[PDB]
Design a protein around this ligand. Sequence first.
Ligand SMILES: *[C@@H]1O[C@H](CO)[C@@H](O[C@@H]2O[C@H](CO)[C@@H](O[C@@H]3O[C@H](CO[C@H]4O[C@H](CO)[C@@H](O)[C@H](O)[C@@H]4O)[C@@H](O)[C@H](O[C@H]4O[C@H](CO)[C@@H](O)[C@H](O)[C@@H]4O[C@H]4O[C@H](CO)[C@@H](O)[C@H](O)[C@@H]4O)[C@@H]3O)[C@H](O)[C@H]2NC(C)=O)[C@H](O)[C@H]1NC(C)=O
Ligand SMILES: *[C@@H]1O[C@H](CO)[C@@H](O[C@@H]2O[C@H](CO)[C@@H](O[C@@H]3O[C@H](CO)[C@@H](O)[C@H](O)[C@@H]3O)[C@H](O)[C@H]2NC(C)=O)[C@H](O)[C@H]1NC(C)=O
Ligand SMILES: *[C@@H]1O[C@H](CO)[C@@H](O[C@@H]2O[C@H](CO)[C@@H](O[C@@H]3O[C@H](CO)[C@@H](O)[C@H](O)[C@@H]3O)[C@H](O)[C@H]2NC(C)=O)[C@H](O)[C@H]1NC(C)=O
Ligand SMILES: *[C@@H]1O[C@H](CO)[C@@H](O[C@@H]2O[C@H](CO)[C@@H](O[C@@H]3O[C@H](CO)[C@@H](O)[C@H](O)[C@@H]3O)[C@H](O)[C@H]2NC(C)=O)[C@H](O)[C@H]1NC(C)=O
Ligand SMILES: *[C@@H]1O[C@H](CO)[C@@H](O[C@@H]2O[C@H](CO)[C@@H](O[C@@H]3O[C@H](CO)[C@@H](O)[C@H](O)[C@@H]3O)[C@H](O)[C@H]2NC(C)=O)[C@H](O)[C@H]1NC(C)=O
Ligand SMILES: *[C@@H]1O[C@H](CO)[C@@H](O[C@@H]2O[C@H](CO)[C@@H](O[C@@H]3O[C@H](CO)[C@@H](O)[C@H](O)[C@@H]3O)[C@H](O)[C@H]2NC(C)=O)[C@H](O)[C@H]1NC(C)=O
Ligand SMILES: *[C@@H]1O[C@H](CO)[C@@H](O[C@@H]2O[C@H](CO)[C@@H](O[C@@H]3O[C@H](CO)[C@@H](O)[C@H](O)[C@@H]3O)[C@H](O)[C@H]2NC(C)=O)[C@H](O)[C@H]1NC(C)=O
Ligand SMILES: *[C@@H]1O[C@H](CO)[C@@H](O[C@@H]2O[C@H](CO)[C@@H](O[C@@H]3O[C@H](CO)[C@@H](O)[C@H](O)[C@@H]3O)[C@H](O)[C@H]2NC(C)=O)[C@H](O)[C@H]1NC(C)=O
Ligand SMILES: *[C@@H]1O[C@H](CO)[C@@H](O[C@@H]2O[C@H](CO)[C@@H](O[C@@H]3O[C@H](CO)[C@@H](O)[C@H](O)[C@@H]3O)[C@H](O)[C@H]2NC(C)=O)[C@H](O)[C@H]1NC(C)=O
Ligand SMILES: *[C@@H]1O[C@H](CO)[C@@H](O[C@@H]2O[C@H](CO)[C@@H](O[C@@H]3O[C@H](CO)[C@@H](O)[C@H](O)[C@@H]3O)[C@H](O)[C@H]2NC(C)=O)[C@H](O)[C@H]1NC(C)=O
Ligand SMILES: *[C@@H]1O[C@H](CO)[C@@H](O[C@@H]2O[C@H](CO)[C@@H](O[C@@H]3O[C@H](CO)[C@@H](O)[C@H](O)[C@@H]3O)[C@H](O)[C@H]2NC(C)=O)[C@H](O)[C@H]1NC(C)=O
Ligand SMILES: *[C@@H]1O[C@H](CO)[C@@H](O[C@@H]2O[C@H](CO)[C@@H](O[C@@H]3O[C@H](CO)[C@@H](O)[C@H](O)[C@@H]3O)[C@H](O)[C@H]2NC(C)=O)[C@H](O)[C@H]1NC(C)=O
Ligand SMILES: *[C@@H]1O[C@H](CO)[C@@H](O[C@@H]2O[C@H](CO)[C@@H](O[C@@H]3O[C@H](CO)[C@@H](O)[C@H](O)[C@@H]3O)[C@H](O)[C@H]2NC(C)=O)[C@H](O)[C@H]1NC(C)=O
Ligand SMILES: *[C@@H]1O[C@H](CO)[C@@H](O[C@@H]2O[C@H](CO)[C@@H](O[C@@H]3O[C@H](CO)[C@@H](O)[C@H](O)[C@@H]3O)[C@H](O)[C@H]2NC(C)=O)[C@H](O)[C@H]1NC(C)=O
Ligand SMILES: *[C@@H]1O[C@H](CO)[C@@H](O)[C@H](O)[C@H]1NC(C)=O
Ligand SMILES: *[C@@H]1O[C@H](CO)[C@@H](O)[C@H](O)[C@H]1NC(C)=O
Ligand SMILES: *[C@@H]1O[C@H](CO)[C@@H](O)[C@H](O)[C@H]1NC(C)=O
Ligand SMILES: *[C@@H]1O[C@H](CO)[C@@H](O)[C@H](O)[C@H]1NC(C)=O
Lengths: 52, 250, 396, 229, 214, 153, 76
Amino acid sequence: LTRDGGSTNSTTETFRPGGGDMRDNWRSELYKYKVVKIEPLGVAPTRCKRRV
Amino acid sequence: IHLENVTEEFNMWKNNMVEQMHTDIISLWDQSLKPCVKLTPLCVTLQCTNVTNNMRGELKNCSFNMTTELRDKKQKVYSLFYRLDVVQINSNKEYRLINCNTSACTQACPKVSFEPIPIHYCAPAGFAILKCKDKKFNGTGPCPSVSTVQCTHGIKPVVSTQLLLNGSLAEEEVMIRSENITNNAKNILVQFNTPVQINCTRPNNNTRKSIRIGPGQAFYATGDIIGDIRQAHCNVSKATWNETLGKVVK
Amino acid sequence: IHLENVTEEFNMWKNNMVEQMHTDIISLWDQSLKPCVKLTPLCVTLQCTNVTNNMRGELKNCSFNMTTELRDKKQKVYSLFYRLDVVQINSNKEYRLINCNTSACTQACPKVSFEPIPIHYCAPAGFAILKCKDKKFNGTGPCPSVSTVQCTHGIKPVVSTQLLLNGSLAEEEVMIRSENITNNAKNILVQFNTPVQINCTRPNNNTRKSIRIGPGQAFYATGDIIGDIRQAHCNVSKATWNETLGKVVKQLRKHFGNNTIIRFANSSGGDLEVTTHSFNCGGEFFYCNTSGLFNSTWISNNDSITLPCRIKQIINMWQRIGQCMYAPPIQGVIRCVSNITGLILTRDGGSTNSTTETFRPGGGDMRDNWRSELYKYKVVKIEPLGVAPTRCKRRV
Amino acid sequence: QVQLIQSGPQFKTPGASVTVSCKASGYIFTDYLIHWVRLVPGKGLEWLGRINTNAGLMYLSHKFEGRLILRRVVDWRTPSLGTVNMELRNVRSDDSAIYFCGRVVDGFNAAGPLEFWGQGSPVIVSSASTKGPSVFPLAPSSKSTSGGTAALGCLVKDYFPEPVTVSWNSGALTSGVHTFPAVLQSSGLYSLSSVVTVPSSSLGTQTYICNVNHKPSNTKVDKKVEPKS
Amino acid sequence: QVVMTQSPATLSLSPGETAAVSCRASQYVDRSISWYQLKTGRAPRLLVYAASSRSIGVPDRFSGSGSGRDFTLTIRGVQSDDFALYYCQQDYYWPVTFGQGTRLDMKRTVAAPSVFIFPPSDEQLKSGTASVVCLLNNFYPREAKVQWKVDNALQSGNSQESVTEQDSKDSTYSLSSTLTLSKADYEKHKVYACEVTHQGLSSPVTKSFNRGEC
Amino acid sequence: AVGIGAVFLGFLGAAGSTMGAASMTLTVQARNLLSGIVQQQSNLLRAIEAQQHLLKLTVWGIKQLQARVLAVERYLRDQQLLGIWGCSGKLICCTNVPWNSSWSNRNLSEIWDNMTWLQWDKEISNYTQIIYGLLEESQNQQEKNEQDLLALD
Amino acid sequence: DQQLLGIWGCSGKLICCTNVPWNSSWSNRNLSEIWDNMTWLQWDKEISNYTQIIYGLLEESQNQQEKNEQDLLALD
Ligand SMILES: *[C@@H]1O[C@H](CO)[C@@H](O[C@@H]2O[C@H](CO)[C@@H](O[C@@H]3O[C@H](CO[C@H]4O[C@H](CO)[C@@H](O)[C@H](O)[C@@H]4O)[C@@H](O)[C@H](O[C@H]4O[C@H](CO)[C@@H](O)[C@H](O)[C@@H]4O[C@H]4O[C@H](CO)[C@@H](O)[C@H](O)[C@@H]4O)[C@@H]3O)[C@H](O)[C@H]2NC(C)=O)[C@H](O)[C@H]1NC(C)=O
Ligand SMILES: *[C@@H]1O[C@H](CO)[C@@H](O[C@@H]2O[C@H](CO)[C@@H](O[C@@H]3O[C@H](CO)[C@@H](O)[C@H](O)[C@@H]3O)[C@H](O)[C@H]2NC(C)=O)[C@H](O)[C@H]1NC(C)=O
Ligand SMILES: *[C@@H]1O[C@H](CO)[C@@H](O[C@@H]2O[C@H](CO)[C@@H](O[C@@H]3O[C@H](CO)[C@@H](O)[C@H](O)[C@@H]3O)[C@H](O)[C@H]2NC(C)=O)[C@H](O)[C@H]1NC(C)=O
Ligand SMILES: *[C@@H]1O[C@H](CO)[C@@H](O[C@@H]2O[C@H](CO)[C@@H](O[C@@H]3O[C@H](CO)[C@@H](O)[C@H](O)[C@@H]3O)[C@H](O)[C@H]2NC(C)=O)[C@H](O)[C@H]1NC(C)=O
Ligand SMILES: *[C@@H]1O[C@H](CO)[C@@H](O[C@@H]2O[C@H](CO)[C@@H](O[C@@H]3O[C@H](CO)[C@@H](O)[C@H](O)[C@@H]3O)[C@H](O)[C@H]2NC(C)=O)[C@H](O)[C@H]1NC(C)=O
Ligand SMILES: *[C@@H]1O[C@H](CO)[C@@H](O[C@@H]2O[C@H](CO)[C@@H](O[C@@H]3O[C@H](CO)[C@@H](O)[C@H](O)[C@@H]3O)[C@H](O)[C@H]2NC(C)=O)[C@H](O)[C@H]1NC(C)=O
Ligand SMILES: *[C@@H]1O[C@H](CO)[C@@H](O[C@@H]2O[C@H](CO)[C@@H](O[C@@H]3O[C@H](CO)[C@@H](O)[C@H](O)[C@@H]3O)[C@H](O)[C@H]2NC(C)=O)[C@H](O)[C@H]1NC(C)=O
Ligand SMILES: *[C@@H]1O[C@H](CO)[C@@H](O[C@@H]2O[C@H](CO)[C@@H](O[C@@H]3O[C@H](CO)[C@@H](O)[C@H](O)[C@@H]3O)[C@H](O)[C@H]2NC(C)=O)[C@H](O)[C@H]1NC(C)=O
Ligand SMILES: *[C@@H]1O[C@H](CO)[C@@H](O[C@@H]2O[C@H](CO)[C@@H](O[C@@H]3O[C@H](CO)[C@@H](O)[C@H](O)[C@@H]3O)[C@H](O)[C@H]2NC(C)=O)[C@H](O)[C@H]1NC(C)=O
Ligand SMILES: *[C@@H]1O[C@H](CO)[C@@H](O[C@@H]2O[C@H](CO)[C@@H](O[C@@H]3O[C@H](CO)[C@@H](O)[C@H](O)[C@@H]3O)[C@H](O)[C@H]2NC(C)=O)[C@H](O)[C@H]1NC(C)=O
Ligand SMILES: *[C@@H]1O[C@H](CO)[C@@H](O[C@@H]2O[C@H](CO)[C@@H](O[C@@H]3O[C@H](CO)[C@@H](O)[C@H](O)[C@@H]3O)[C@H](O)[C@H]2NC(C)=O)[C@H](O)[C@H]1NC(C)=O
Ligand SMILES: *[C@@H]1O[C@H](CO)[C@@H](O[C@@H]2O[C@H](CO)[C@@H](O[C@@H]3O[C@H](CO)[C@@H](O)[C@H](O)[C@@H]3O)[C@H](O)[C@H]2NC(C)=O)[C@H](O)[C@H]1NC(C)=O
Ligand SMILES: *[C@@H]1O[C@H](CO)[C@@H](O[C@@H]2O[C@H](CO)[C@@H](O[C@@H]3O[C@H](CO)[C@@H](O)[C@H](O)[C@@H]3O)[C@H](O)[C@H]2NC(C)=O)[C@H](O)[C@H]1NC(C)=O
Ligand SMILES: *[C@@H]1O[C@H](CO)[C@@H](O[C@@H]2O[C@H](CO)[C@@H](O[C@@H]3O[C@H](CO)[C@@H](O)[C@H](O)[C@@H]3O)[C@H](O)[C@H]2NC(C)=O)[C@H](O)[C@H]1NC(C)=O
Ligand SMILES: *[C@@H]1O[C@H](CO)[C@@H](O)[C@H](O)[C@H]1NC(C)=O
Ligand SMILES: *[C@@H]1O[C@H](CO)[C@@H](O)[C@H](O)[C@H]1NC(C)=O
Ligand SMILES: *[C@@H]1O[C@H](CO)[C@@H](O)[C@H](O)[C@H]1NC(C)=O
Ligand SMILES: *[C@@H]1O[C@H](CO)[C@@H](O)[C@H](O)[C@H]1NC(C)=O
């Protein structure tokens, strides 16, 4: 759907069948996925020491 | 695997993988056409008249000259075209194809089907896909329950304009979502709680004919329509459609 | 490196690398044609008549209209073709090229030689090739002596139908191999103890002529023949052929029950490329009818055979329907002097109560030419990790 | 699954060359000998030859040598698929038969037990051309010949090719009807001595119309009958 | 070439009886006989592919057997679709050869033919040709013949004969016979007859006319 | 599904558990960080197989091959960076850099017993480029001190 | 391989002794005949039943050993 401004008065909601680039057909199916890069290294403090 | 106690921000508008899908589909489309015959010799002057055996004025019947396989020999030949495929270049009226001033065209190979198979998108090593599991998610915010997965749903690459079909549908309620709603230049995507089922038909008993353009190259002409010529059209139930709008309005 | 003390099971029929070799040769062949001129303007109506100055009805003399470099100008011109290159499209008779209803053709570039160089196939890192060393190994089973090698022998990619030539020879005795022998749909491959040597020739003194099709594109017409015209043919020493078949028969008797009447016959029926021995010599493609060689019978007890040939300018390799190519006529007179290494046989069912041993020169896909040379190789993956018990422990 | 598909039926003129194709599917097509077997109608089967679908060689019954050629089409890709073509050259009218494509039993590539068969292609050979039947009444055989059964018919005669279609009273009469199977006569045309038998109470008073049609010409005819002298 | 003999020419059996069809070769062939069932309008079907080796997918009522020169297809409990043609086939020597085949016929009691004749149609005579037609109707067993007579002297080679499929209702058959002449040859004679021969008849039933009457 | 200790037998399943309990599962991310390439090398395939001509769709496989070289190389860089701190053999190291509690004031209990690793990341990501500098230098001198000891003996 | 050989606590070495006891159900064969009679190609064909058990035991044996060492350094 695509919307329009206040059509005369009271309604702000004349809706019309929209469109655009086909790209948002993919955004319909990919609506819930995300991608992330793992960062496996960590550094954190505790009470242990190495010896030489 | 459910990532226990996890909660993080999804945003489907700024999402990268939609743009990879768009770019992949365009590239896969082009290479499905690249091995097929370039139809250039069809960009030639046509003599035409309206079709006979019918309301419609949409079909024109057109005759033209075309090369045989032998370079020095050419034939009179004829085919049916839609009023949208042809332009009056002009006694009888005289035409060309619509594209013929701006580009050549490729004929799509008959052995290759346009039907959309399921496709899965998979993460390369040292990356993970996350999936927001929450059935009330609107496409922008902190999702309070998530899974990782190695690879997506079987997404199917349909293409359509005003409404979208054979795709997946949410279980909780009709979902409506937008990058802002209040700004008119943004779309609203609506996803239904249940399908509504469309039947579509092309009632002409259509006949293909083959023309050799050259040595091993052939063009598939519209040859003839047997029986009555009748309009292509689609049906949907007035009752369940009216009910479905009754839900999106709420 | 000879692997001390080893013994493991080889199988040449289920061997993957013959399929890689087959698939690679096709790809290398295509790229060797890829830049060369597409001959589409030659698919045009030809006036023709027979050649004059000569038995041979095989040469057609043909005239047609061809483009120049200038789009608005075209020229009447003429060339010779073999009767196998043309179809009567139709007063004098009138013709087209054979391909001209099914594909364009690429003319093979004159600068590229067809001649088969030695090729070595090499193991990628973390894999090893094995080679079976046992000189009495047939195509399957536990080879009792093996070496690793990083890369193969210099295998040369010859292409031939009914018999195979310039290939490798078994040292011990005539060898025969099959995926089962008894099941007639399988080939019997035969490999010789010693080669037998063939001379081939095309005695017509060819003059090539250049036609310019277009702005920078040239087509190499058969221009003229100088002197008399005479048949292309091949020769082999009858005594050494008769000796060689005497040795192959003495092997086949071991499988086929001693006192059975083994006999040879020609490649019965179908088209030219199943019925003939076909090979390239220096840029001409020969097709020769081997019935002079395969016509004999064998009870359990100084001169040349000649066999004639026919020639084509267009060829269509590996039965790839869309892929015509046109070979330009090579200048002067040619001959080849080559070692027949071995031959491909096909069996027939029990002809009578007495015999099950009519044999005919076989064929199929070119792929078992590679299976002749790759018969002793195998490829394996190193698994370098191992775990085993002993009596040592780590401490903390 | 194993499946052989042949070409549809054909009509050919004497001295022509006839081609029957056979598509082969569902098994490694190179690994079984295909055979050709001919069913001449009323007579026993006859064997033409066999083809080694790998090597492409053919072997023929001696009687058919020179006059017959078998060919094989295949690709090294898609080995589960292939084709065989039979060309019988220089046909006679007595080559009129069904030609069957067939395949041997598994592991039995040295003999003739055929497990899988194509649907059989009829090849009928005549100089004739498309012609509807003449309809002649076999007007009911009289009480001075037939006794208590009124035998009647229609000699639907001299047509080509098959089929005719025949009924009595446009199919309202079926009791005692016999559309005798057609003979392809010495003329090169079919004939069909059709009959119906009914009680001699009703020699011509009850209705008897033979209803006749011939789909190759699309010719259609009908004829009423009553008793002879 | 190897000659195959079958016997009988036809075997007549009731549903649930047992069948034995013989085949024999002109010289030794080593167990290498196939048997085919042929049902009309369909490809032959392989029952047995060497002596006693039943085909896969064939019901066990069929069993082959044989020596090196003679062979026997056997069926236990003959069923409603077992009524068909059966051929033995030999392939020990090329070319492959087949017997004349044996018909399997549904046994039923003896029934004599009813018999009729027709002169040529008046329109047929006017068209310049003359077919004289004879009908033999619903007899059993199948064995029937017409003898055609002109001036009621017996004649040959001037006729064709057609026979029905086996009647599924009652096992009977019918035969339609047709003598044919040019109208001149028809009118050069004055008497016509069809004489009927059948397995059960008292004497050959003969139906007759003088030319122009039935 | 949801809770501490339960999903640790799957990749990342620990991510909402607290840092102490998550410290048992470290081998699972470490293995799946590289060997997930099984889902590439099992199924990457070229001409003749599935495809014939359309040749840019064989050369499309550069996307999949480029992902593989990034994966092995980004992994290999961790083994370098963990190596120069004098620590390559191990999933855990004690080291002789003292914790400057300016980097976080939070006590030893609450970091191990309350926070998740995704929460701790957002503190120390301010200071980590200090801490990596200190770790490198602490090892660089230790290598020399050991060489002098093995010499002066 | 270098990853898998690493997580057993064995990364620097061609040979390791390790704290997993050999369950002779994996092979009943005595210490002489395994080292003195068999080739490595013969041994593979036995232990290829149990290898995925032995790798699991090696992993867990190391994974707790790292923690026991961290405590032995923490009790300073
Ligand atoms: C290498 O290549 C060979 C040749 O192709 C191949 O050998 C062939 O093996 C098949 C296996 O099926 C043999 O086929 C027949 O098998 C049946 C078994 O029948 C029972 O089981 C089947 C299961 O499907 C059921 O259908 C059936 O109802 C039964 O329950 C046998 O009955 C056949 O008997 C014939 O062969 C016997 C010898 O094995 C003979 O004693 C007998 O007479 C039969 O006829 C043969 O002898 C005739 C007279 O000499 C001769 O003229 C005939 O042509 C025929 O040879 C039969 O065994 C098949 O026989 C084998 N082929 C040949 C030519 O013998 C190997 O399997 C293959 N090996 C590998 C590893 O690939
Ligand atoms: C589209 O235009 C084409 C070309 O003008 C039309 O095709 C031609 O149609 C005529 C009849 O209007 C055909 O002639 C008839 O052919 C039959 C052949 O058996 C003959 O019996 C008739 O006496 C008559 O000659 C003609 O064959 C046909 N083709 C050509 C090349 O002229 C066509 O009718 C138009 N409409 C459609 C739906 O195609
Ligand atoms: C197919 O090709 C043919 C042959 O090129 C075309 O037919 C020809 O078309 C031209 C142009 O319309 C005709 O020219 C006219 O001729 C008359 C009489 O000479 C003259 O008065 C006009 O001024 C004009 O010059 C020509 O007659 C016609 N026929 C021939 C035999 O040349 C045809 O147009 C092409 N297209 C189709 C759909 O057939
Ligand atoms: C999709 O759903 C999420 C919740 O799951 C919606 O989040 C809401 O986003 C708006 C801004 O888009 C937030 O409004 C802001 O709130 C602060 C309150 O301190 C105020 O100062 C700002 O002026 C502004 O109003 C809102 O707090 C946030 N949460 C909720 C519960 O509404 C999101 O808007 C939804 N998107 C669509 C397009 O429906
Ligand atoms: C889409 O909806 C339309 C309207 O409901 C459907 O059209 C109707 O289809 C039936 C079956 O084809 C037509 O009945 C037939 O009509 C002809 C002409 O009167 C008659 O000869 C037949 O015996 C039969 O009664 C019906 O007339 C037609 N109704 C209208 C108003 O056009 C259509 O079938 C639906 N489905 C699809 C897939 O489009
Ligand atoms: C193949 O066909 C071509 C074309 O018909 C033949 O070529 C032409 O042959 C004639 C003689 O048969 C040539 O004419 C003579 O040329 C000489 C040149 O010195 C001249 O002295 C004579 O007075 C006479 O003009 C003609 O030039 C030649 N070329 C063409 C384009 O016509 C050819 O002979 C046939 N046979 C072969 C083997 O090529
Ligand atoms: C090479 O190109 C030339 C020119 O296009 C071709 O020559 C021409 O061929 C045609 C067709 O055979 C000749 O037409 C005939 O003309 C006579 C007299 O007018 C007429 O009675 C016939 O019905 C027919 O139309 C034409 O005369 C001839 N020459 C010219 C100048 O047009 C030639 O066929 C092409 N091929 C070769 C191998 O030369
Ligand atoms: C190449 O040489 C090897 C020997 O080096 C041949 O191996 C033979 O393979 C056949 C099966 O193809 C074996 O027959 C089977 O033997 C077992 C014995 O337990 C028996 O139970 C089976 O019924 C069957 O007879 C055979 O024993 C074996 N050895 C020999 C010496 O033949 C291999 O077949 C040769 N390749 C070719 C194409 O002949
Ligand atoms: C292949 O084998 C044939 C037969 O052994 C060889 O044919 C022989 O070739 C020579 C040289 O061309 C011929 O000599 C010449 O014969 C002609 C006609 O008699 C004469 O005018 C010459 O003065 C000269 O003597 C020889 O007659 C011929 N032999 C026979 C019996 O035909 C051929 O050379 C072999 N070579 C190749 C490359 O295949
Ligand atoms: C395989 O070998 C056989 C026997 O050597 C070849 O059979 C022969 O084929 C030729 C074809 O040229 C037949 O020649 C002709 O004879 C008849 C008259 O009988 C004539 O009408 C034809 O015009 C032609 O000149 C020949 O009869 C036949 N048999 C013999 C004894 O030669 C067969 O062609 C060979 N196949 C191949 C591909 O090598
Ligand atoms: C099988 O092997 C033979 C023997 O090598 C191949 O025949 C020919 O071998 C000779 C010597 O290697 C080639 O000679 C060279 O020719 C070039 C070009 O003329 C020249 O520059 C060199 O000085 C040398 O004389 C000869 O070209 C070649 N013959 C041909 C026509 O190819 C044979 O090609 C091999 N393959 C087959 C299928 O027989
Ligand atoms: C290569 O193939 C040909 C067939 O294409 C083989 O058969 C030979 O074909 C020729 C021509 O048809 C036969 O010619 C004979 O001519 C005399 C003339 O008097 C005639 O009486 C004979 O009946 C026959 O037609 C020739 O006899 C025939 N060959 C044999 C062995 O009989 C040819 O044999 C093949 N080439 C070689 C070297 O074998
Ligand atoms: C293929 O094998 C057959 C036998 O299976 C060969 O049979 C006969 O062999 C002779 C000598 O090669 C042929 O030549 C003629 O022999 C007569 C003998 O009286 C002689 O008078 C003639 O002057 C001539 O030398 C004979 O035609 C041939 N007969 C038959 C029926 O084939 C045959 O020659 C072999 N063919 C080849 C090309 O190997
Ligand atoms: C979701 O994550 C939270 C932490 O972010 C988990 O909450 C609770 O975490 C504490 C440690 O911070 C756990 O306390 C310990 O529990 C054991 C067994 O009860 C006890 O022996 C120790 O002395 C200490 O109290 C606590 O178990 C844990 N759960 C609860 C219910 O408090 C939470 O476990 C995660 N969600 C789920 C459903 O597991
Ligand atoms: C139908 O045919 C007439 C006469 O040829 C033409 O004027 C009219 O424009 C045609 N209709 C359409 C919609 O093309
Ligand atoms: C169906 O349409 C009518 C008119 O638009 C409307 O009154 C009715 O409420 C709709 N049905 C539902 C269930 O809303
Ligand atoms: C040779 O030329 C003549 C006359 O042009 C022709 O009749 C004959 O058919 C030609 N030869 C062949 C083999 O066609
Ligand atoms: C040469 O051929 C003849 C006839 O086939 C045969 O008698 C002779 O034994 C052959 N030579 C040898 C060495 O076998």
